[PDB]
């Protein structure tokens with residue numbers, strides 16, 4: 001029995017997925033998260049209570065759609081909660097818990113094309129993940145409907161999507177939620193649409209070994225309680241209505257050696273030829289004054305940025321709208337400076353730059369509303385034509401305006417350093433191109449929040465993406481699933497069941 005194996009070994013081994021978004025997947029920090037993974041954590045805690053082993057160790061191992069049943073049967077892991085369909089054929093090989101979600105198998109395809117339904121796949125190349133129910137359905141469409149599809153089978157859902165994205169398939173067949181999760185990780189999410197009448201409705205269950213009724217009972221009792229108590233719907237909201245923190249994230253950590261914070265993150269700039277220019281950011285902040293500051297636990301700043309133009313503006317310029325929210329990404333006033341940001345605060349930004357000897361200045365003004373995390377700024381190049389693309393300066397051109405929720409205000413270093421302020425320094429390394437070094441002082445001067453920056457760029461290619469002005473005027477934002485919980489799911493959460501559909 002699995003509970004006997006766990007008790008004897010002092011460990012419970014939890015299988016998990018790499019990229020089943022938003023069910024079980026790695027976030028930007030290589031931590032396993034998602035709606036289904038919440039159940040894994042709850043089941044792990046229920047096992048600790050059942051066995052009265054509060055120090056039980058937890059081992060996470062990655063599985064695929066293809067290897068999940070062999071690795072379960074040979075004891076490599078003990079259970080998994082992810083995106084595995086409960087059906088009668090698989091019940092010959094494994095057991096399933098109460099259902100945790102229901103999906104429909106559809107198609108992801110590029111907009112502007114001719115794939116509107118499954119009938120349009122005739123004679124075409126279609127990608128699917130090896131070892132899935134969709135792979136079976138595609139082969140059945142070939143055998144029974146003479147569709148003559150060339151079926152490309154990829155190792156995991158991210159590999160499947162990237163096959164579609166690169167043009168090597170006309171469509172990706174998969175569970176519709178998983179398709180939306182892969183689209184959210186795309187270079188250009190808005191290029192992709194989910195189409196087609198669903199070929200099946202499928203229930204996700206947590207998978208465990210068969211003929212182990214006592215472990216299945218613990219699992220079902222735990223799931224049914226989470227569902228009937230409302231916690232499952234809270235998990236749905238958490239993982240289906242909040243930014244997916246995989247791409248375009250900002251992860252803040254404490255830099256205690258310097259009484260401040262640091263961050264290491266990646267900005268992806270779209271190139272006008274369809275490629276992506278990586279801008280690797282390393283950031284360090286340290287207080288200007290000697291007063292006490294707040295040193296945070298690890299957390300994210302989730303940025304939503306919109307770049308626009310002012311129609312009545314003849315100078316080279318950028319209008320920037322941003323919403324910035326601090327968040328954790330976990331399963332399952334605090335400074336005097338905080339008080340200085342309860343209203344709307346005028347902002348002044350001054351940047352003096354030199355990229356490959358090309359000297360330029362930027363002046364910005366606007367306001368910050370940290371209660372809502374909202375920034376409105378307009379920047380002008382006061383020296384003429386800006387010699388680099390505006391999107392490359394967005395991150396350089398006031399994290400004190402992030403919205404820290406009530407339960408996280410003890411982690412707001414940026415406001416705690418105010419009014420005396422902080423130094424913000426970055427290296428921005430453009431892949432296959434030059435590097436920005438930036439140094440800013442951010443401080444309250446009277447009632448104005450001032451961001452004064454020096455920027456030094458070196459080693460840029462004069463015909464490259466930056467000095468050659470080949471970057472699109474836009475910005476990548478972390479997306480959310482933007483799904484609502486269906487009536488069918490709410491009825492299931494009221495009356496949990498483990499039935500294949």
Ligand SMILES: N[C@@H](CCC(=O)O)C(=O)O
Pocket residue numbers: 020065083084085086131132133134175178202
């Ligand atoms: N739910 C389907 C596809 C998703 C997956 O395998 O991760 C299956 O179990 O085959």
